[PDB]
Amino acid sequence: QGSAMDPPTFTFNFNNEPWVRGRHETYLCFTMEVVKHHSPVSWKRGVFRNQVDPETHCHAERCFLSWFCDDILSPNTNYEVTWYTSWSPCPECAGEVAEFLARHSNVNLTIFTARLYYFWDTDYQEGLRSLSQEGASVEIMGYKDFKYCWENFVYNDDEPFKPWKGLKYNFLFLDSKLQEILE
Ligand SMILES: [Zn+2]
């Protein structure tokens, strides 16, 4: 589960301009409601933070899966889990994930992402492709969701969310490209 992020670390890593430059980390946020015989018994949620440069799988998406398996995934359960990530995933992790999913119906996942990482690369595209196609919701994190993250996952000091400019357009464009990839 880790720690929440100070406001700087958040607004910086969650800034949604498609070509932002200097974001050497994927910040992965999540809410998860555990659900045993249909009654949600508990809710746990958190923030994993690591690098995005390809050295194998010390990728945020994997440190997630390792933790999920160590301290959770009980035998007979159903999980509800969703992700607020700063960068979309690499394609290799998009693999290990989509796979773990096809291999566990008792996990339902949905992905909200500030940015599409390398959205123009046939290979990254095909990753997103197999996540959508294999039972995961995948969409571009917009206003609703940003505010959501400002309150939940950040040491905000009970202060209010202040949007950055273009956030509305930045969203609009990323979603155009995304519905494009999947079309
Ligand atoms: Zn990765």
Side-chain angles (χ1 to χ4, degrees), residues 32-56 58-96:
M32 191 209 17
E33 129 192 51
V34 190
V35 197
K36 205 161 188 138
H37 32 90
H38 260 90
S39 311
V41 349
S42 54
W43 309 253
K44 236 328 176 231
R45 69 188 177 171
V47 138
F48 291 122
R49 333 155 166 215
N50 33 47
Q51 304 315 91
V52 43
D53 157 20
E55 72 151 359
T56 304
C58 216
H59 281 164
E61 288 91 6
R62 205 182 157 262
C63 296
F64 185 84
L65 283 174
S66 166
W67 162 102
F68 177 42
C69 289
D70 294 344
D71 296 333
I72 307 213
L73 192 117
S74 159
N76 193 12
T77 306
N78 261 31
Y79 297 72
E80 210 60 346
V81 48
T82 50
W83 272 1
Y84 294 103
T85 37
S86 75
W87 270 124
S88 97
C90 82
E92 185 233 313
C93 303
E96 301 188 48

Side-chain angles (χ1 to χ4, degrees), residues 26-56 58-132 134-157 159-166:
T26 306
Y27 275 82
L28 196 149
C29 298
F30 65 111
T31 67
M32 191 209 17
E33 129 192 51
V34 190
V35 197
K36 205 161 188 138
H37 32 90
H38 260 90
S39 311
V41 349
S42 54
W43 309 253
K44 236 328 176 231
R45 69 188 177 171
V47 138
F48 291 122
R49 333 155 166 215
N50 33 47
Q51 304 315 91
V52 43
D53 157 20
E55 72 151 359
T56 304
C58 216
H59 281 164
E61 288 91 6
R62 205 182 157 262
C63 296
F64 185 84
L65 283 174
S66 166
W67 162 102
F68 177 42
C69 289
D70 294 344
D71 296 333
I72 307 213
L73 192 117
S74 159
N76 193 12
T77 306
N78 261 31
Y79 297 72
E80 210 60 346
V81 48
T82 50
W83 272 1
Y84 294 103
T85 37
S86 75
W87 270 124
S88 97
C90 82
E92 185 233 313
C93 303
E96 301 188 48
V97 179
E99 188 50 14
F100 192 83
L101 278 194
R103 200 154 299 257
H104 300 65
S105 309
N106 60 284
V107 179
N108 210 100
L109 159 88
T110 276
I111 319 239
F112 284 118
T113 190
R115 274 163 259 138
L116 296 195
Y117 188 53
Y118 275 44
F119 62 94
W120 56 81
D121 188 315
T122 153
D123 272 325
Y124 284 70
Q125 283 183 26
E126 256 164 310
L128 303 174
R129 302 269 304 164
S130 62
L131 273 169
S132 199
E134 289 288 318
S137 187
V138 176
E139 280 153 332
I140 289 94
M141 175 175 171
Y143 179 46
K144 306 289 185 153
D145 322 305
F146 276 105
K147 189 199 199 306
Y148 186 104
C149 295
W150 172 256
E151 290 149 355
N152 297 37
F153 304 108
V154 230
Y155 289 158
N156 50 310
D157 303 318
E159 295 246 346
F161 181 38
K162 320 219 334 179
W164 47 81
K165 287 213 119 182

